[PDB]
């Protein structure tokens, strides 16, 4: 995160780290939705253009993490994957449309103070909250400027109107996509950056005080840049795919 801020302990007990075995390093961010399922960007696992093709036997999930680099000894939980499911329609080809993937843990995780599931939106929460001018929160261990933080970073970005989002890039935006950031003439700033992908875009319901993941860090052309914005997978819209693979397996 850029122009972000260290995260308070147990602020996002759902944030998960995608970490590869050989070689041991950070791949992306992810999210805990249930005890055996994890959400993330499909591009964290499949990006043919960069010869990226990870498979369960190449991945491990780290849940309960605050510190980026260290092995948080009695807090964090490491888990192995049983299987990866990628939106059959993930468009790695053109504009990362349907950039969503679900991962299945070989064994479920016991929840605690640092490990806890985030809520998936519902048709009304999304209608109430996915409003332009409203703010969401982004977390991740990604580059600190367009660099690596010691601790999880955080930031609050408003939802930018469709047009504006559209008028900021050469890429082709879809309906399964939203953008967020402050408009250059508003003093404040901040963004998502490389390493933060698969990372959640939550909001707090003013109705039930629950936190809902609304987006997934998807893409953006450079970090914190005037007249530019961050793009996130619109999760409610892909909701129905989620349930599917969840009801099947």
């Amino acid at each position: 995160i850029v122009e972000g801020s260290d995260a308070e302990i147990g602020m996002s007990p759902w944030q998960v780290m995608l970490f590869r075995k050989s070689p041991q390093e950070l791949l992306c961010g992810a999210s805990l939705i249930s005890d055996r399922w994890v959400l993330t960007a499909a591009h964290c696992l499949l990006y043919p253009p960069w010869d990226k093709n990870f498979t369960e036997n190449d991945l491990l999930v780290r849940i309960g993490k605050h510190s980026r680099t260290r092995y948080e000894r009695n807090i964090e939980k490491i888990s192995m994957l049983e299987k990866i499911y990628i939106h059959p329609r993930y468009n790695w080809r053109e504009n990362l449309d349907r950039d969503i993937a679900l991962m299945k843990l070989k064994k479920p995780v016991a929840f605690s103070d640092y490990i806890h599931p985030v809520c998936l939106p519902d048709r009304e929460t999304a209608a109430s909250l996915l409003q332009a001018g409203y703010k969401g929160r982004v977390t991740g261990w990604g580059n600190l400027k367009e660099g690596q933080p010691s601790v999880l970073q955080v930031v609050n970005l408003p939802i930018v109107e469709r047009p504006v989002c559209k008028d900021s890039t050469r890429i082709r935006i879809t309906d399964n996509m939203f953008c967020a950031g402050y408009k250059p003439d508003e003093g404040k700033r901040g963004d998502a950056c490389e390493g933060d992908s698969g990372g959640p875009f939550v909001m707090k319901s003013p109705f039930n005080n629950r936190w809902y993941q609304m987006g997934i860090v998807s893409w953006g052309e450079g970090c914190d840049r005037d007249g530019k914005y961050g793009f996130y997978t619109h999760v409610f819209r892909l909701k129905k795919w989620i349930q599917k693979v969840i009801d099947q397996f």
Partner: peptide, 7 residues
């Protein structure tokens, strides 16, 4: 590497 060995 910048990372701490895992069990």
């Amino acid at each position: 590497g910048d990372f701490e060995e895992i069990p």
